[PDB]
CSV table of C-alpha atoms and ligand atoms in Angstrom, one decimal:
chain,number,residue,atom,x,y,z
A,1,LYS,CA,20.9,-1.2,26.7
A,2,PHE,CA,24.0,-3.1,27.6
A,3,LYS,CA,27.8,-3.5,26.9
A,4,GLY,CA,27.6,-2.7,23.1
A,5,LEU,CA,24.1,-4.0,22.5
A,6,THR,CA,21.4,-1.8,21.0
A,7,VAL,CA,17.9,-2.2,19.8
A,8,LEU,CA,16.8,-0.3,16.7
A,9,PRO,CA,13.3,1.1,16.2
A,10,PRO,CA,10.9,-0.1,13.6
A,11,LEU,CA,10.5,1.9,10.4
A,12,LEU,CA,6.7,1.8,10.7
A,13,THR,CA,5.1,3.1,13.9
A,14,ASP,CA,2.1,1.3,15.3
A,15,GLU,CA,-0.1,4.3,14.4
A,16,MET,CA,0.8,3.8,10.7
A,17,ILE,CA,0.0,0.1,10.9
A,18,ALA,CA,-3.4,1.0,12.5
A,19,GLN,CA,-4.0,3.1,9.4
A,20,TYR,CA,-3.4,0.2,7.1
A,21,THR,CA,-5.8,-1.9,9.1
A,22,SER,CA,-8.5,0.7,9.1
A,23,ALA,CA,-8.2,1.1,5.3
A,24,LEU,CA,-8.6,-2.7,4.8
A,25,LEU,CA,-11.7,-2.6,7.0
A,26,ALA,CA,-13.2,0.4,5.3
A,27,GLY,CA,-12.6,-1.0,1.9
A,28,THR,CA,-14.1,-4.4,2.6
B,1,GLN,CA,18.2,21.6,-4.1
B,2,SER,CA,19.0,20.2,-0.7
B,3,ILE,CA,18.3,17.4,1.8
B,4,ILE,CA,15.2,17.1,3.9
B,5,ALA,CA,13.5,14.9,6.5
B,6,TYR,CA,9.8,14.2,6.8
B,7,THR,CA,7.1,11.7,7.8
B,8,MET,CA,6.1,9.3,5.2
B,9,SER,CA,2.8,9.2,3.3
B,10,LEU,CA,1.1,5.9,3.3
B,11,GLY,CA,-1.1,6.9,0.4
B,12,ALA,CA,-3.9,9.1,-0.9
B,13,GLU,CA,-7.3,9.3,0.7
B,14,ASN,CA,-10.4,7.8,-1.1
B,15,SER,CA,-13.9,8.4,0.1
B,16,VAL,CA,-16.4,5.8,-1.3
B,17,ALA,CA,-19.9,7.2,-2.0
B,18,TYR,CA,-21.6,4.5,0.1
B,19,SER,CA,-25.3,4.3,0.4
B,20,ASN,CA,-27.9,1.6,1.1
B,21,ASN,CA,-29.1,1.4,-2.5
B,22,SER,CA,-26.3,2.4,-4.7
B,23,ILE,CA,-24.0,0.2,-6.8
B,24,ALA,CA,-21.1,0.8,-9.2
B,25,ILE,CA,-20.7,-1.4,-12.2
B,26,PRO,CA,-17.9,-1.2,-14.8
B,27,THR,CA,-18.6,-0.5,-18.4
B,28,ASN,CA,-15.2,-1.2,-19.8
B,29,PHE,CA,-12.0,-3.1,-18.9
B,30,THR,CA,-8.3,-3.3,-19.8
B,31,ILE,CA,-6.0,-6.3,-20.1
B,32,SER,CA,-2.9,-5.7,-18.0
B,33,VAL,CA,0.4,-7.6,-18.0
B,34,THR,CA,2.9,-7.8,-15.1
B,35,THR,CA,6.0,-9.8,-14.4
B,36,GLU,CA,7.3,-11.7,-11.4
B,37,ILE,CA,11.0,-12.8,-10.9
B,38,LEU,CA,11.9,-15.8,-8.7
B,39,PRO,CA,15.3,-17.4,-8.0
B,40,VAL,CA,15.4,-21.1,-8.4
B,41,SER,CA,19.1,-22.2,-8.0
B,42,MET,CA,22.4,-21.1,-6.6
B,43,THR,CA,26.0,-22.1,-7.5
B,44,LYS,CA,27.4,-25.5,-6.6
B,45,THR,CA,30.7,-25.1,-4.7
C,1,LIG,C1,-21.4,8.2,-7.7
C,1,LIG,O1,-22.2,9.2,-7.3
C,1,LIG,C2,-21.6,9.9,-6.2
C,1,LIG,C3,-22.7,10.9,-5.7
C,1,LIG,O2,-23.9,10.3,-5.3
C,1,LIG,C4,-20.3,10.6,-6.6
C,1,LIG,O3,-19.6,11.0,-5.4
C,1,LIG,C5,-19.5,12.4,-5.3
C,1,LIG,O4,-18.6,13.0,-6.2
C,1,LIG,C6,-18.4,14.4,-6.1
C,1,LIG,C7,-17.5,14.8,-7.3
C,1,LIG,O5,-18.0,14.4,-8.5
C,1,LIG,C8,-17.9,14.8,-4.8
C,1,LIG,O6,-17.7,16.2,-4.7
C,1,LIG,C9,-18.8,14.2,-3.7
C,1,LIG,O7,-18.2,14.5,-2.4
C,1,LIG,C10,-19.0,12.8,-3.9
C,1,LIG,N1,-19.8,12.2,-2.8
C,1,LIG,C11,-19.5,11.3,-1.8
C,1,LIG,C12,-20.6,10.9,-0.8
C,1,LIG,O8,-18.4,10.9,-1.7
C,1,LIG,C13,-19.4,9.7,-7.4
C,1,LIG,O9,-18.4,10.4,-8.1
C,1,LIG,C14,-20.2,8.8,-8.4
C,1,LIG,N2,-19.3,7.7,-8.9
C,1,LIG,C15,-19.0,7.6,-10.2
C,1,LIG,C16,-18.1,6.4,-10.5
C,1,LIG,O10,-19.4,8.3,-11.0
C,2,LIG,C1,-13.2,0.7,-23.9
C,2,LIG,O1,-11.9,1.4,-23.8
C,2,LIG,C2,-11.1,1.4,-24.9
C,2,LIG,C3,-9.8,2.1,-24.5
C,2,LIG,O2,-9.2,1.4,-23.4
C,2,LIG,C4,-11.8,2.0,-26.1
C,2,LIG,O3,-10.9,1.9,-27.3
C,2,LIG,C5,-10.3,3.1,-27.7
C,2,LIG,O4,-11.2,3.9,-28.4
C,2,LIG,C6,-10.6,5.2,-28.8
C,2,LIG,C7,-11.8,5.9,-29.4
C,2,LIG,O5,-12.3,5.3,-30.6
C,2,LIG,C8,-9.5,5.0,-29.7
C,2,LIG,O6,-8.9,6.2,-30.0
C,2,LIG,C9,-8.4,4.0,-29.1
C,2,LIG,O7,-7.5,3.7,-30.1
C,2,LIG,C10,-9.1,2.8,-28.6
C,2,LIG,N1,-8.1,2.0,-27.8
C,2,LIG,C11,-7.7,0.8,-28.2
C,2,LIG,C12,-6.7,0.1,-27.3
C,2,LIG,O8,-8.2,0.2,-29.2
C,2,LIG,C13,-13.1,1.4,-26.4
C,2,LIG,O9,-13.8,2.1,-27.4
C,2,LIG,C14,-13.9,1.4,-25.1
C,2,LIG,N2,-15.2,0.7,-25.3
C,2,LIG,C15,-16.4,1.4,-25.2
C,2,LIG,C16,-17.6,0.5,-25.4
C,2,LIG,O10,-16.5,2.5,-24.9
C-alpha cells in the first residue's frame, strides 16, 4: 500500500480455479 | 425479502459411471440454434 494506491483482490480465488481445472481433467 | 452475502457456486456435481468396458451412445439428437453478436465499426469523428 502507498499514498493513495491500492490493489484489489480477484473475484475468483485460486481454489476455485483449481476446481475448474480438475473438472476439465476429470471430464477428458 | 432482504440482502445476503455468500460464496459462489461454480456448478452442479456430475459423477460419470466410468468402467473399463462400458460405453454410452446417443439414440436421439436435437438441432439447436444460438446467436453471437460482434461489433465491426465505430463512429467516424
Ligand atoms: C449407466 O449405468 C450406470 C450404472 O452402471 C448408471 O449410473 C448409476 O445411476 C444410479 C441412478 O440411476 C446412481 O444411483 C448410481 O450411483 C450410478 N452409478 C455410478 C457409478 O455413478 C447410469 O445412470 C447409466 N447411464 C445411463 C445414461 O443410463
Ligand atoms: C427423438 O426425439 C424427438 C423429440 O425431440 C421425438 O419426436 C417427438 O415425438 C413425440 C412423441 O411422438 C411427439 O409428441 C413430439 O411432437 C415429437 N417432437 C418433434 C419435435 O417432432 C422423436 O420421436 C425421437 N425419436 C425416437 C426414435 O425416439
